[PDB]
Amino acid sequence: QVQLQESGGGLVQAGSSLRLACAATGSIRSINNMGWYRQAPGKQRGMVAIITRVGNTDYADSVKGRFTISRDNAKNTVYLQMNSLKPEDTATYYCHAEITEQSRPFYLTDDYWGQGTQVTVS
Amino acid sequence: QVQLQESGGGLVQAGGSLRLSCAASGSTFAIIAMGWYRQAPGKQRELVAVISTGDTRYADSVKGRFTISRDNAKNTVYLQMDSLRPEDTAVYYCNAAVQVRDYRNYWGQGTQVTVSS
Amino acid sequence: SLTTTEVVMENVTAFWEEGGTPVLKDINFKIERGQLLAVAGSTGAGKTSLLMMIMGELEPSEGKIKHSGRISFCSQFSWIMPGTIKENIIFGVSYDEYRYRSVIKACQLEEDISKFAEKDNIVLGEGGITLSGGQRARISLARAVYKDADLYLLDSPFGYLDVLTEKEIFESCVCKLMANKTRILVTSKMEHLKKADKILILHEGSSYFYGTFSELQNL
Ligand SMILES: Nc1ncnc2c1ncn2[C@@H]1O[C@H](COP(=O)(O)OP(=O)(O)OP(=O)(O)O)[C@@H](O)[C@H]1O
Ligand SMILES: [Mg+2]
Ligand SMILES: [Mg+2]
């Protein structure tokens, strides 16, 4: 009874900027790491950016300096500010989170993924 | 965001001992690992000892003679140098791997160790 | 007792500050040679401190800790020392071509090394290449795993890795390459606990769970 949901995707032009959001909902007790990943047709899924509960970040070399990952612990939401969009950025963007469900007697996490949002850069 | 200062260097006769110290100072910082390097004139700096937390590593040339250790309460690292040889003559530098909100390494300014025959 | 018992903790309590809150209270576990112990629990539970005790950085106020041989520790914070990628992996340990290649592969460093003209002779630092957080975490794990040891203390080595890379390295390095090594892995992921021979769940220094994955799943 836990869900991740991405939003803010769409069809945009090269050089434009876009903001993605991913909200963790349901029977959440706690969240550790959260991150943004992407997969393009024919290509394998790969990390874009990750963020710890403390707010420490890491970026794939291809997006560093263009994209920023941020986190709001009160809303259990992770954001991806994408600037200077390139046609190579066209992909389905997926959100991940390490989550401790409420019905678990211990501080243990399970990996959850969102359904994904398409980002098409013209 | 961190300053390192070495001390303890100087002139000593072969077979003698020396204890180098490296003091880290600053405001907000967490030391991850500390290393000791040595440099002969016109040569590259050579890593001789490193300590993370209670895990130590030594260059072959220094094994059994040098010991690296930390005073965790004080942000200091030491290099106990025993059975010193003329070939140990060099400038010794400490280097700290630190988290100051971002990851960085810092160099000290070095201390001359001269070992006579 | 038996030569095959790598590490034991019997009735262990310890304090960082004398007279303060015990960081670990009445800890008991026994790890046989080649087993994987997962150490789980929330922030401040005493997981890194437990490794520190094994390493002799924290002595218990009561109880007994025994470990056979040499330890190799991987800090929860990754680090490098100015020098080559190769030196950042092997420093203080003799070169062994096969081990080296097997560690680079298991830690997914092959691809990253191949991008440089100097390959693993590439110099790391302000004046050379700056590794990303992910690269630094993989090289720090490779440094710890390359060293031949009787006991590997892996303190959350995937905390700064993306989940796709983490799964690959947990499988290729911790589970396959290190299959017969004694390992204490600090992790609270169910995906990791599934593979452990024993699990210790710490809560505010106390042992809230100690047993197998079947015993945990049943609870
Ligand atoms: N090197 C140290 N010296 C003194 N006190 C320490 C040291 N390391 C940790 N402590 C203290 O011991 C307590 C237990 O923390 P510890 O670091 O063992 O937790 P942890 O389970 O590793 O947490 P996390 O999951 O966040 O890494 C904390 O109060 C902590 O600040
Ligand atoms: Mg056995
Ligand atoms: Mg810890």
Taking CA atoms, A88 is separated from A40, A58, C112, C115, in Å, by 9, 20, 21, 20
Hey, what are A92's tokens? 């389905």
Q: How far apart are CA C214 and CA C102, in angstroms?
A: 32
Q: How many domains does chain B have?
A: 1
Q: How far apart are CA A9 and CA A117, in angstroms?
A: 5
How far off is chain C from A86, nearest CA to CA, in Å?
Answer: 22
The closest alpha carbon to C131, from C76, C74, C73, C88, belongs to: C88
The CB density around residue A83, as the number of other CB atoms within 10 Å, is 14
8-state DSSP, C129: B
CB-based contact C72:C152 (threshold 8 Å)? yes
Question: What Rg, from alpha-carbon coordinates, does chain C have?
Answer: 18
Q: DSSP labels for C8-20?
A: EEEEEEE-SSTTS
The closest alpha carbon to C74, from C177, C146, C171, belongs to: C146
Size of interface A-C (CB pairs under 8 A): 66
Q: DSSP labels for chain A?
A: -EEEEEE--EEE-TT--EEEEEEEEESEEEEEEEEEEEE-TTSPPEEEEEE-TT--EEE-TTTBTTEEEEEETTTTEEEEEE-S--GGG-EEEEEEEEEEETT-SSS-BEEEE---EEEEE-
Q: How far apart are CA B22 and CA C71, in angstroms?
A: 26
List beta partners, residue C103: none
Q: DSSP labels for B50-110?
A: EESSS-EEE-GGGTTTEEEEEETTTTEEEEEE-S--GGG-EEEEEEEEEESSSEEEEE---
Cβ within 8 Å of residue B16, ≥6 positions away: B84, B115
Q: Report yes or no: A55 at the C interface, CB cutoff 8 Å.
A: no
Listed by start position, the domains of chain C span 1-219
Q: Which residues of C touch B97 (CB under 8 A)?
A: 79-81
Identity of the amino acid at C173: C
Chains meeting C at 3+ CB pairs closer than 8 A? A, B
CB-based contact C19:C2 (threshold 8 Å)? no
Residue of C156, C163, C170, C204 to mutate when probing chain A, most A C-beta within 10 A: C163
The closest alpha carbon to B34, from B45, B43, B44, B21, belongs to: B21
Q: How far apart are CA C38 and CA A26, in angstroms?
A: 28
Q: Report yes or no: A59 at the C interface, CB cutoff 8 Å.
A: yes
Q: Which ligand is nearest to the CA of B53?
A: 1
Which residue, judged by its Cα, is nearest atom 31 of ligand 1? C44
Q: Backbone breaks in chain A (C–N > 2.5 Å) follow which residues?
A: none
Q: Which residues of B touch C154 (CB under 8 A)?
A: none
Which residue, judged by its Cα, is nearest atom 6 of ligand 1? C16
Cβ within 8 Å of residue C118, ≥6 positions away: none
Hey, what are B69's tokens? 């250790």
Taking CA atoms, B11 is separated from A70, B5, B64, C105, in Å, by 54, 19, 21, 47
Cβ-defined contacts of A68-72 (< 8 Å, 24+): A69/A35, A69/A36, A71/A34
Taking CA atoms, A3 is separated from A19, A24, A51, C42, C169, in Å, by 20, 6, 18, 22, 26
The angle subtended at Cα C199 by Cα C197 and Cα C202, nearest 5°, is: 165
Q: Which helix (H) or strand (E) holds C39?
A: strand C36-40
Please, how many CA atoms are within 13 Å of residue B11, restricted to the half-sphere of its CB? 2
From C17, C23, C53, the mutation candidate for ligand 1 (largest count of ligand atoms within 8 A of CB) is C23
Task: Judge residue C128's burial from the number of C-beta atoms within 10 Å of its C-beta, 0-12 exposed, 13-18 middle, 19 or more buried.
Answer: middle
Q: How far apart are CA A106 and CA C41, in angstroms?
A: 8
CA torsion, ordered C105, C107, C113, C114, to nearest 10 deg:
40
- Mapped onto helix, strand or coil, the DSSP state of residue C183 is strand
Which technique was the structure solved with, according to the deposited record? X-ray
Q: Report yes or no: C20 at the B interface, CB cutoff 8 Å.
A: no
C43 lines ligand 1 (CB under 6 A): yes
Pairing mode, if any, of strands A18-26 and A77-82? antiparallel
Task: Judge residue A39's burial from the number of C-beta atoms within 10 Å of its C-beta, 0-12 exposed, 13-18 middle, 19 or more buried.
Answer: middle
C25 alpha carbon, distance to own chain's centre? 22
Task: Tell which atom from ligand 1 comes closest to the C-alpha of C202.
Answer: 21
Q: How far apart are CA B56 and CA C154, in angstroms?
A: 16
Hey, what are B50's tokens? 């490193």
Q: How far apart are CA B78 and CA B70, in angstroms?
A: 6
Task: Tell which atom from ligand 1 comes closest to the C-alpha of C57.
Answer: 1
Hey, what are C18's tokens? 């004398």
CB-CB: which of C73, C81, C93 is closest to B54?
Answer: C73
Which residue, judged by its Cα, is nearest atom 12 of ligand 1? C23
- Mapped onto helix, strand or coil, the DSSP state of residue B19 is strand
The CB density around residue B3, as the number of other CB atoms within 10 Å, is 12
Cβ within 8 Å of residue B90, ≥6 positions away: B38, B39, B40, B46, B112, B113
Phi/psi for A6 (5° steps) reads: -85, 150
Nearest CA in chain A to C137: A58
Distance of CA C206 from the midpoint of ligand 1 (Å) = 14
Q: How far apart are CA C219 and CA C196, in angstroms?
A: 16
Cβ within 8 Å of residue B95, ≥6 positions away: B4, B34, B35, B36, B37, B105, B106, B107, B108, C81, C82
Identity of the amino acid at B78: Y
Task: Tell which atom from ligand 1 comes closest to the C-alpha of C76.
Answer: 27
Note down the domain range covering B69: 1-117
Q: Report yes or no: C88 at the B interface, CB cutoff 8 Å.
A: no
Q: How far apart are CA A23 and CA C146, in angstroms?
A: 40
Q: How far apart are CA C100 and CA C177, in angstroms?
A: 12
Please, how many CA atoms are within 13 Å of residue A94, restricted to the half-sphere of its CB? 18
How far off is chain B from C108, nearest CA to CA, in Å?
Answer: 21
CB-CB: which of B32, B47, B99 is closest to C87?
Answer: B47
Hey, what are C31's tokens? 């790890």
Nearest CA in chain A to C166: A47
CB-CB: which of C55, C57, C81 is closest to B50?
Answer: C81
**Domain C1-219 part of CATH 3.40.50.300:** yes
The CB density around residue B103, as the number of other CB atoms within 10 Å, is 20
Question: What Rg, from alpha-carbon coordinates, does chain A have?
Answer: 14
Q: Per the CB < 8 Å rule, is B95 touching C126?
A: no
